[PDB]
Amino acid sequence: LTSAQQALTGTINSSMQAVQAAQATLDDFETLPPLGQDAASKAWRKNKMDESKHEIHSQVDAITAGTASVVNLTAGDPAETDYTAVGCAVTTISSNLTEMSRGVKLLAALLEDEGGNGRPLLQAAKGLAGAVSELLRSAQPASAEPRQNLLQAAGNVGQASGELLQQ
Numbered sequence: 001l002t003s004a005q006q007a008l009t010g011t012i013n014s015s016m017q018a019v020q021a022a023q024a025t026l027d028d029f030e031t032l033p034p035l036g037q038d039a040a041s042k043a044w045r046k047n048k049m050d051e052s053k054h055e056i057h058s059q060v061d062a063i064t065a066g067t068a069s070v071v072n073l074t075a076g077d078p079a080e081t082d083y084t085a086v087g088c089a090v091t092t093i094s095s096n097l098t099e100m101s102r103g104v105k106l107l108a109a110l111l112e113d114e115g116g117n118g119r120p121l122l123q124a125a126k127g128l129a130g131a132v133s134e135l136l137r138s139a140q141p142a143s144a145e146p147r148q149n150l151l152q153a154a155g156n157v158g159q160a161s162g163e164l165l166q167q
């Protein structure tokens with residue numbers, strides 16, 4: 001039975017949709033533009049891989065911190081929780097996950113394109129995206145807890161982000 005915990009349930013619902021979408025986008029690379037062995041082509045591939053590696057670290061970082069905010073904001077006996085604040089933090093997580101996915105598709109694309117292999121990247125991105133969802137599942141005001149469930153979820157985010165960063 002809920003209050004303006006219902007306001008939170010909606011945000012979680014909206015962010016879960018966003019996550020499941022990002023999660024679907026991670027089955028494949030972006031189609032690259034027509035490149036070849038043109039020198040230019042080469043600077044383009046390179047410049048994009050850098051920015052993409054950077055942008056991704058930035059977004060994962062914002063992921064682990066949002067997760068940490070979710071855990072801290074959701075602890076301490078409900079009936080005191082700032083539900084709107086929890087809401088804003090899960091918005092930070094999901095919003096970032098969306099952008100992380102675009103980045104990783106491009107980067108996996110670039111690895112793959114040049115003899116590398118991007119599947120693991122894509123896989124590990126999927127990995128992070130699914131742990132993100134397990135977390136939003138547990139942060140749902142209607143959960144019959146128990147607290148440990150939410151903690152193990154916050155800890156899986158971090159573990160998947162970890163593996164993700166090893167590219």
Ligand SMILES: [Pt+2]
Binds near residue numbers: 013016137
């Ligand atoms: Pt859901």
Ligand SMILES: [Pt+2]
Binds near residue numbers: 110
């Ligand atoms: Pt690269």
